[model samples]
Target chain A: GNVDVELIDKSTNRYSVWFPTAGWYLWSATGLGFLVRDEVTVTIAFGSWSQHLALDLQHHEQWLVGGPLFDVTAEPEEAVAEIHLPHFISLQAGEVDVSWFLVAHFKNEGMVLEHPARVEPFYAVLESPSRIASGTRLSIPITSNTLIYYHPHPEDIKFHLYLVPSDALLTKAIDDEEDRFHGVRLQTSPPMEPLNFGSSYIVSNSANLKVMPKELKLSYRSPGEIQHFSKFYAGQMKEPIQLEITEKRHGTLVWDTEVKPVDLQLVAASAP
Target chain B: LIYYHPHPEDIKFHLYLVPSDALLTKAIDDEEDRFHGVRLQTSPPMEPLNFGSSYIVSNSANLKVMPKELKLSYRSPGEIQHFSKFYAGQMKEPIQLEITEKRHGTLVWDTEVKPVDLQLVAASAPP
Candidate 1:
């Protein structure tokens, strides 16, 4: 019984990432699954040196996102961790996979194993459409868009929501992403209209969104297999629903509101 | 998770689930008297504030667009979860949000919303 565990290298990155990640959104950088193994040495590197850490098995499934994942004496050198995530989201489930535990049960090679060390980290991301529709696809892929990391997110964790303009983001995620950082947000002025540009609305204090839908549809897509959400809303973006996103990638939101046209209004919810 | 309210009391005004007396309890307790979870001088505030003891340990935890202006603290209990009037995206915190009291539509801490210096945002959370 062997399993293969592969981590993404510094190849590409996700949306316009924040340097000191924008609070709850830090958890958004993580997918809804376990990425770190109880035994893996979740390392905190400082370029010159690295601090080794371990995952708490009892809560190993959910990785830490907001604070130091582990209490360690030594800090990091690089000041940040470019933690890549697993390909856990996709509208289509496209491949066969191995459970990390199954592989560990009988550590094999056709499979995988690490005698010296392996710092398996966990992370997340999001994707949706320009508008909402019944059965419309909403995918959240965390494999590539490396979410920022410094500590462990709370067991009662939640994330933030925002709609920035596309131009605000750089195409690729860089090691020092701040170098390419730009401050942008949803359109607010001109004609006194708030729902027109991008980077619309926000919800950061609570754990989840308030939009609870009647039908909840979603599935996990392994590195290959894919799955996602569906929006059953009213009509086109108009007076109340128009938004401004200074963003590059798209996102899918399932909300319980009036007329629901891929309907979305960043009102606060309870958890993440 | 510190859930954000469109305004300081937005959390109280909106999400206040009618306390079910823990689904059922007795009269005299009055804990559930605020059953609707929304009332004048909102007790327990909107969101749970670090849930310390029954009262001996609550902290001054709060949520705000910035540390200064319009900061909502834990002590304002019995305070409504929402304001009578409000405006949005005018302060320095890079987002659109707020509320108010006392005057004609209250001019807020600032009048005519100085037009927030908006910043591109990047954020997310658990699904």
Candidate 2:
């Protein structure tokens, strides 16, 4: 049909989430990056359990396939899919978010799609120090031309640093994201003990490291690191929204290496 | 198909230059080490690794492990994508680029933002 379809509920949008899994429904289309061909198949009828999505396009595009939009059934979720484009594709789409790279397949009739997915998240950034006044103690500085020296095997690289409170997991987190963003994983201790400097070390010693952006400062005082950064915390608490660098291979997540996200202003704690 | 971070260390990488265009402006007037901006290409895009001098101390070296020479811009022309974190000792060295190719459409190029590289900033419309 030269394709066009829609369903709506990108987790209610704003910073969005469904990613990889959770009621699963991320099958995008609008020209699949002008489809050049690799593998394509689409069929999502949902009249009573019909799903099959296998759009591999290989180095993925078109948000890399997903399924399960509505089935556990009371049947009325209304779904449709018919995409067949290959005459050397071309759809200069717009007013649709308007968007492909071809190679699609969604044909097990209702639930057959979701493979090695990760529409995005491998890029990392979260520097620091924009305001910091809650408990004071922020240090991060390292340079030797960094992504951890272009990692050929920079010590297997498992670096981590997160203090989530409000950028809500900052770009997709699934299943206990380190006890839900209570992360400190440098494997631990002296922040993994590799302190050195000079010339292209680009530079270091934010006071010799490890005050760790603050614990970003007392979680912001309440009853001592709030009994444990709010002990086994869960999500949405506010103040301390920036600072995350994830190279977690999927958590073991090796999007290889990344770091950047430093925006502090607990300035007496957004409201203490 | 763009992901670079060759020593995007000292913080923030992937491709960035901001202070908002007209060529990132003044570059702190002069001194901050040096950086002039544009091209926030971000996303698996870090091709850096070019060192002719942002001040490299020592090295006419006795070391050999092989390989060097990388420079990336993440691809360009009309857009709204975000990514930042910098300090090549505070940018202002061999930094400052603004090349628009030849244009008319998205007023120099925005053809419609797609993982990007518009036709090579080599951008388009010489028609």
Candidate 3:
């Protein structure tokens, strides 16, 4: 079968080639270099260099080439590689069409950040002007907000960065959420009150874990000159315990009696 | 005129001045010998007990006395005609009562009450 492979030159280079899928074709250019299969070599008559280019088989026909994707210029002392790409490219998928804008740029000399990276659908590719550094950064597209940098030593097999929330930030967030929950509880029906406010307990000391004042008796003078009393029982506790009562906005304390340590005794019934 | 007096050996007893409309009247009157005699020093000494008139003292009363038949009184004037003192032989111990004013307020007695033996009613009297 004959498959047409097109190498589109979107850079400032005079390299041209067209081949049918069958066997390897070796070619060379005047200023660019000699390309053998997927390898390229450059000769300046006085100096020479060799490199390997990355190739990707796109959908069906388009052959995406990477090694020569940058513009190369040679000076007396050094050679400079300048990378370039179109502003954006539109991709169509079924009825939805999306645009991927160039978001990040990096070079061997340094790096620059002019605009903040967009949170939309975006991608990044790692390519070097010279193929010698081909496998240094794998040609992988980043589709997430997180950027993973591989360690220089392949044997270490460790990532350089990991994304995590700051400890202080996480603690503050939890505290804020708890405060919101308490606010909601106060607004709910029945009006939840603080546990210790307007409440008291009696405690005792015994191996059976007895507490003094198992029950509470409250007294108050009514506005109508009448006396009122209330009785409440609570969970058990061990002595020594104290009776603590506080007034709250939801309720008021009327009268309280002094509590003292006293021994409990049983009463004998009378005979008929 | 002198009605009755506590014997020389008898110390004292409780005098519960309950109201006519109180809830405890029915239950207090139901018990046979509810307050026939006072036990010796059953209640803690000198400690005062307080409660509302509308409240019922259905349980034990800690009193400081030893005599037969604690006195039962009414808080309302002339309202005592509708009610009578209960004297059951089974009540061999002093039964404490929470006395009240004519209204629902608690009544504090300033004077000590004397305990006595109740005289039996004549057999000809209405049961």
In the range B99-123, model 1's lDDT, one tens digit per residue, is 2221010111222343211111111
TM-score of each: 0.17, 0.17, 0.14
DockQ of each: 0.01, 0.01, 0.00
Candidate 3: regions farther than 4 A off:
A1-249, A254-272, B1-104, B108-110, B113-127
- Sorted into a CAPRI-style docking class, model 3 comes out as incorrect
Write one digit per residue (lDDT tens) for candidate 2, span A27-138.
2331111111222222222211111222222112223211112111111112211111111111123211111221222233422221221122211111111111111111
True lDDT of residue B39, candidate 2: 29
* Candidate 2 DockQ, CA atoms: 0.01
What is candidate 2's lDDT per residue for B20-42, written digit by digit as tens? 11111011112221222232333
Least accurate stretch of 10 residues (summed lDDT) in model 1 chain A? A129-138
* Residue-level lDDT for B110 in candidate 2: 25
**What is every candidate's alpha-carbon RMSD to the true fold?**
22.0, 24.9, 40.6
Question: Where in model 1 is the C-alpha error above 4 Å?
Answer: A1-58, A61-272, B1-9, B12-67, B71-127
The clash count of every prediction, one per candidate, is 74, 60, 10
Q: Please, what are the lDDT tens digits per residue for candidate 1 over residues A100-125?
A: 21111111222122121221333222
Q: Chain B vs. true chain B: TM-score for each candidate?
A: 0.17, 0.15, 0.15
Error of 2 at A266 (Å): 4.2
